[PDB]
């Protein structure tokens, strides 16, 4: 077996490299240090970190959002520190419970939620600028930023775009561990079972495919690490036996194959499509479809099944039944 694919047997140390960027080389703070146990399964060097304007703006806005959330959470346990740790998972900051439409809600019923939403959104935009500009500063393409953009766009969809399209802030995602989980069922119940939303299906198809692709790609590179397949950039520009064997393994298995470069386009595309499909689904939901199951029945797609115990009429529609 190739033990190098499991962990680094003999680690190496050397002077720390610094690639200069078009700006901000002085905003790298911290002194690098080395972790021997990290170095078994990764690169041993931790830090320094770049510390630009957008990154600080992100930390500023983020912490503001975190603080607004934590304070409202603590209010929910009347500031008892012990119950706060006990009940942490169950605590939350909720959008309005009452229907104000799109009017700004009272602070006690969703205003603080809206506030925390604003500052998180600013934090996401600020970090996006960091992710984008750091690439151009180092003379790299902006591929990560465009993937990250789709992920931010999906959050905005469930956070505020879908609420504004249907016209009620009551539909946003709460802040908190269990409560953001509870939203998923409330939403799916409201809109007629999300299994029958084709864009749920698409998103899941791509999410599962990301698991398929990264398991397959990761396994492939490790299987050709003896020929240096991990040095992917020079295998793109000068095809070595590593990527020839990787390409032929798949071709002989499934009948076709990618290149060392194109496999990353596949992977990048699949990842992006998780978020793009999710967003189309949310954008259609509530605006143009009210019950995804009935929409599938309307178009003849839903499965049906025999009764097992007897079919049961809606009692509310029998004559003389109470309301």
């Amino acid at each position: 077996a190739d033990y190098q694919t499991i962990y680094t047997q003999i680690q190496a140390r050397g002077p720390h490299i610094t690639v200069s960027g078009e700006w901000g080389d002085n905003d790298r703070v911290g002194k690098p240090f080395y972790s021997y146990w990290l170095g078994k399964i990764g690169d041993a060097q931790i830090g320094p970190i770049y510390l630009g304007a957008s990154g600080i703006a992100a930390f500023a806005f983020g912490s503001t959002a975190i603080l607004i959330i934590l304070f409202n959470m603590a209010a929910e346990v009347h500031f008892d520190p012990l119950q706060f740790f006990r009940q942490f998972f169950w605590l939350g900051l909720y959008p309005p419970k009452a229907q104000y439409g799109m009017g700004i809600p009272p602070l006690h019923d969703g205003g603080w939620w809206l506030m925390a939403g604003l500052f998180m959104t600013l934090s996401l935009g600020s970090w996006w600028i960091r992710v984008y500009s750091r690439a151009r500063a180092l003379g790299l393409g902006t591929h990560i930023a465009w993937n990250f953009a789709a992920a931010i766009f999906f959050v905005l969809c469930i956070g505020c775009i879908h609420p504004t399209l249907v016209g009620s802030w009551s539909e946003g995602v709460p802040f908190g561990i269990w409560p953001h989980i509870d939203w998923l069922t409330a939403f799916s119940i409201r809109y007629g079972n999300f299994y029958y939303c084709p864009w749920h299906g698409f998103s899941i198809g791509f999410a599962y495919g990301c698991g398929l692709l990264f398991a397959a790609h990761g396994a492939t590179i490790l299987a050709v690490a003896r020929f240096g397949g991990d040095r992917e950039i020079e295998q793109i520009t000068d095809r070595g036996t590593a990527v020839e064997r990787a390409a032929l393994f798949w071709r002989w298995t499934i009948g076709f194959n990618a290149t060392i470069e194109s496999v990353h386009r596949w992977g990048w595309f699949f990842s992006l499509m998780v978020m793009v499909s999710a967003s189309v689904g949310i954008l259609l939901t509530g605006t143009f479809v009210d019950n995804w199951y009935l929409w599938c029945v309307k178009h003849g797609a839903a499965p049906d099944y025999p009764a097992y115990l007897p079919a049961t009429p809606d009692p509310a529609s029998l004559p003389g039944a109470p309301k």
Binding site: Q11, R13, R226, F288
Partner: protein, 258 residues
């Protein structure tokens, strides 16, 4: 009346369903599957004789060439014509189209099958700032083994047949990634040096076990041009040599395990 309704039993969501499939198949078929073809294409048939005109599908399945501007000068364009020149010491075991080939000579030296190397540039891989990337420690003197880990320098190398075959004299390190990639070893009784990819090395505290080849087979490991640097093609030649041993070192390794 209904949000999203259109005339004659259409609704918007129904249209977007069709559009979404169209987008997917467009990207997969017209973009990704052509990107997949920037290597190894056009395919090779039992002699493609029509030298006067190309067959239509071979033009259609290819993307427009792209050019990489290399970091230390030069350009590479893909796809491009790159036939495999060197004579392969293989013979067809049958007349069938996809019957396997057989090695006629010694497949490790002849560099066929799992011992095959790619025809990469006879060029030394470089750091950001132009230096040789893969160098032995005698040259890379500001690099050390990390405290905790076996220093293999001095340890013996035991081959598959249990015979000591040489002594590890140096480690080659990737200066770009801070990662050891090869051990250098003197092959006992042959007055030469050989490189070994770490991935073929079982690093124990008193020995380096190497199961891919026999002790005698260390004699014909591809040699380098220079002592203190390696070319990309040499890296392929060296790595491939041991991998060829997985199937060829003994007659029994190519036959079925059951």
């Amino acid at each position: 009346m209904y949000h999203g309704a259109l005339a004659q039993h259409l609704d918007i969501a129904q249209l977007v369903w069709y559009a979404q499939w169209l987008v997917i198949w467009t990207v997969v078929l017209l973009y990704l599957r052509r990107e997949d073809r920037r290597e190894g294409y056009p395919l090779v048939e039992p002699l493609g004789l029509v030298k006067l005109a190309p067959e239509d599908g071979q033009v259609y399945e290819l993307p427009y060439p792209k050019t990489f501007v290399l970091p230390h000068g030069g350009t590479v364009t893909v796809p491009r014509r790159r036939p495999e020149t060197r004579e392969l010491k293989l013979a067809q075991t049958d007349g069938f189209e996809g019957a396997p080939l057989q090695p006629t000579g010694n497949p490790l030296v002849d560099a066929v099958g799992p011992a095959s190397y790619a025809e990469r540039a006879e060029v030394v891989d470089a750091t950001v700032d132009g230096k040789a990337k893969i160098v032995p420690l005698r040259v890379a003197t500001d690099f050390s083994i990390a405290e905790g880990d076996v220093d293999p320098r001095g340890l013996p190398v035991v081959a598959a047949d249990g015979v000591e075959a040489g002594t590890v004299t140096d480690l080659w390190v990737d200066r770009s990634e801070h990662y050891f990639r090869y051990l250098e070893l003197s092959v006992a009784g042959s007055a030469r040096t050989a490189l070994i990819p770490l991935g073929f090395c079982d690093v124990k505290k008193d020995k380096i076990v190497v199961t891919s080849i026999l002790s005698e087979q260390f004699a014909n490991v591809p040699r380098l041009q220079s002592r203190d640097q390696i070319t990309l093609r040499e890296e392929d030649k060296v790595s491939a040599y041991y991998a060829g041993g997985l199937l060829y070192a003994t007659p029994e390794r190519a036959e079925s395990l059951l």
